[PDB]
């Protein structure tokens, strides 16, 4: 006979953007209605010694 | 839709004279500007050893 000893999956590691350090740069926001959204924008003010 | 989420201003830091160090080299003093006749006759006899 031949025999078959166990058969083995993929044990897939999960990844999230919240965890990495890489998202120390970020602030990340959720927004529901950002399909909506065209642009966005800041103005920024300064006056000089 | 069109977003606009902020408005910035520059925040301006302070310069006084007393509080430098360049202000130890000097001796400032305020006066009245008594017009003086171009006051520049200050003269000193200083003992010699």
Chains 1, 2 share one sequence.
């Not at 006979?1 to 058969?7: Q, R, S, V």
């Not at 990495?20 to 300064?46: C, E, P, Q």
Request: aromatic share 16%; charged share 15%; hydrophobic share 50%.
């Amino acid at each position: 006979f031949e025999a078959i000893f166990g058969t083995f999956c993929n044990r897939l590691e999960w990844v999230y953007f919240l965890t990495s350090g890489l998202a120390a740069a970020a602030h990340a926001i959720k927004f529901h209605d950002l399909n909506k959204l065209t642009t966005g924008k800041m103005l920024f003010h300064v006056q000089v010694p």
